[PDB]
C-alpha cells in the first residue's frame, strides 16, 4: 500500500551486512552445525553435496583452496543485545512464544512467581542487613566474617518462612510507622502566645 514501505522500515530492523555478496566466502554449513537434531546426518550430507558441487566432486580443490568462516554470524550477540534493549518485552515475547505454547497450571505459575518474589524479598533484607553491619562498623565494632548465620554462641533469625502459617503470625517492621511523638506539636503553643504578646 501507500505507507507500507515507510512503516515496515520504521517498525523493524533489517540486516546491513553484505556478507553473502562475495561468492566464494559463502558457507556450506560446516561453521555452525546442529549436532542433536534427528535429521543430523541429512544435514551433513547436504554440506558434503554443497562442497562437491563447488569443486565438481574433486575435493582436492577444496583442500588447496582457502576456507572461510561464516561472516554472516559476525556481531550477532551484539545485535541481539541491542534488540533486547530497544524492546525488551517484545524480544522476550517472541523468543518465548514456542515455549509458552505449553502453559503450566495456575499452581505451577504461582509457585514460580512466589518463590521468585520470595527470593528477591530475602535478597532485599540481606542488603538491608549489610547496611546495618556498615553502621555497626562505623560505630566502632570491627566485624570478622559476615552475615547473620552465627557460627558461635548466638541466636540466629533465619527469616520468615514464606508459608501462610508464619505469614499470619509475623509481619516485617514497617519503617514508615516509626514516627516523631505528636507532643512535638505542643511546642506551637509557644508561637501562639508570642504572637499575642507582640500584638500580631
Amino acid at each position: 500500500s501507500l505507507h507500507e514501505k515507510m512503516q515496515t522500515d520504521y517498525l523493524w530492523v533489517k540486516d546491513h551486512s553484505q556478507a553473502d555478496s562475495w561468492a566464494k566466502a559463502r558457507t556450506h554449513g560446516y561453521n555452525y552445525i546442529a549436532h542433536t537434531v534427528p535429521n543430523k546426518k541429512e544435514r551433513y550430507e547436504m554440506i558434503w553435496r554443497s562442497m562437491g558441487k563447488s569443486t565438481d566432486w574433486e575435493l582436492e580443490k577444496f583442500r588447496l583452496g582457502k576456507k572461510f568462516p561464516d561472516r554472516g554470524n559476525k556481531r550477532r550477540w551484539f545485535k541481539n543485545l541491542f534488540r533486547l534493549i530497544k524492546n525488551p518485552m517484545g524480544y522476550i515475547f517472541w523468543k518465548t512464544y514456542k515455549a509458552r505454547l505449553a502453559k503450566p497450571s495456575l499452581i505451577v505459575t504461582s509457585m514460580f512467581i512466589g518463590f521468585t518474589l520470595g527470593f528477591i524479598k530475602l535478597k532485599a533484607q540481606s542488603i538491608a542487613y549489610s547496611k546495618k553491619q556498615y553502621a555497626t562498623l562505623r560505630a566502632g565494632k570491627n566485624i570478622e566474617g559476615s552475615g547473620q548465620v552465627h557460627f558461635g554462641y548466638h541466636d540466629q533469625k533465619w527469616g520468615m518462612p514464606a508459608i501462610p502459617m508464619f505469614q499470619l503470625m509475623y509481619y516485617e517492621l514497617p519503617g514508615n510507622s516509626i514516627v516523631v511523638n505528636p507532643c512535638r506539636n505542643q511546642n506551637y503553643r509557644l508561637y501562639f502566645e508570642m504572637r499575642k504578646k507582640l500584638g500580631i
Binding site: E4, W12, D15, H16, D20, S21
Partner: protein, 231 residues
C-alpha cells in the same frame, strides 16, 4: 472436510440441543391460590406491547442520522427486522425458555435502544462508516461519467460482452451457453485484474511455501546500509 465425530456433542442433561430450558436443581413449580399467602414476582404481560414500542423507537431514533437517505432507511429496516425475527425462526424453542422468553428478549432489546438513543450503538457506527465508503465510490463514478470517461466497471462489462461473443462464435457444435461457462469467463478476468492491482498481500504463502510479508527476508544477506534522504 472434517465433521464432529462425537455423537453426543449436542446432548445436555435436559435433552438434545436444549439451550432454552437447561436442567438445574431449583426447577419451576406451580403455585396454588388457596394455599399462597403472598408472592414476589416480576413477571407480567407487558412484553408484547413493549416489543412493538421498542421496534418503533429503534427505527425512528436511528433514522435521525440517516440524512433522508431512502435506500439506507430501507436497508436498515431489513437489518432491524432480522434482529427482531430471531425468536420467531431460531432452532431454540423460544416459547419454552426457562422463565419467559418474551420478557428476556424485550429486556435485551431495551439495552440496545438505550445505546441507540445516545447514537453510540456499534451497529450505528458501522452503518455510517459503510455508507460513507459506499457513497465515496459512487461519487467517483459520477464524476467520471460527467467527464465522458468510462468507469472501471463499464470497461469490464464491455470486455466481458465481447468475450461471450468470441466464445459463442467458435462454439457452434453446442449452443447451450451455461451459467457455469459464463462464470468462469468472468472469474478468469477477475483474477487477472486482481493480480494486476498493487494490493497488500492477503494470502499467507505466495507461490513458494514462504510467507509474503516484509519480515520474510532470510539469508543470503545482500542489502547494504540504508541510505539517507536526497537534497
Amino acid at each position: 472436510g472434517y465433521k464432529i465425530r462425537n455423537k453426543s456433542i449436542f446432548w445436555t442433561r435436559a435433552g438434545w440441543k436444549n439451550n432454552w430450558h437447561p436442567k438445574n436443581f431449583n426447577a419451576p413449580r406451580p403455585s396454588y391460590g388457596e394455599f399462597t399467602m403472598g408472592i414476589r414476582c416480576r413477571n407480567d404481560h407487558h412484553s408484547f406491547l413493549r416489543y412493538v414500542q421498542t421496534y418503533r423507537n429503534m427505527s425512528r431514533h436511528c433514522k435521525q442520522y440517516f440524512l433522508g437517505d431512502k435506500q439506507l432507511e430501507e436497508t436498515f429496516i431489513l437489518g432491524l427486522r432480522s434482529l427482531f425475527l430471531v425468536p420467531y425462526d431460531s432452532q431454540c424453542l423460544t416459547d419454552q425458555i426457562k422463565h419467559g422468553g418474551e420478557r428476556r428478549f424485550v429486556d435485551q432489546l431495551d439495552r440496545d435502544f438505550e445505546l441507540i438513543s445516545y447514537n453510540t450503538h456499534p451497529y450505528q457506527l458501522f452503518t455510517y462508516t459503510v455508507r460513507n465508503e459506499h457513497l465515496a465510490w459512487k461519487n467517483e463514478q459520477y464524476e467520471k461519467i460527467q467527464k465522458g470517461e468510462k468507469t472501471f466497471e463499464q470497461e469490464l462489462l464491455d470486455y466481458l460482452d465481447e468475450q461471450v461473443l468470441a466464445e459463442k462464435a467458435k462454439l457452434r457444435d453446442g449452443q447451450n451457453f451455461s451459467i457455469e461457462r459464463m462464470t468462469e469467463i468472468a472469474l478468469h478476468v477477475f483474477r487477472k485484474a486482481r493480480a494486476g492491482k498493487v494490493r497488500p498481500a492477503q494470502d499467507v504463502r505466495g507461490p513458494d511455501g514462504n510467507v509474503n510479508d516484509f519480515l520474510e527476508q532470510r539469508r543470503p544477506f545482500e542489502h547494504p546500509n540504508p541510505t539517507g534522504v536526497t537534497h
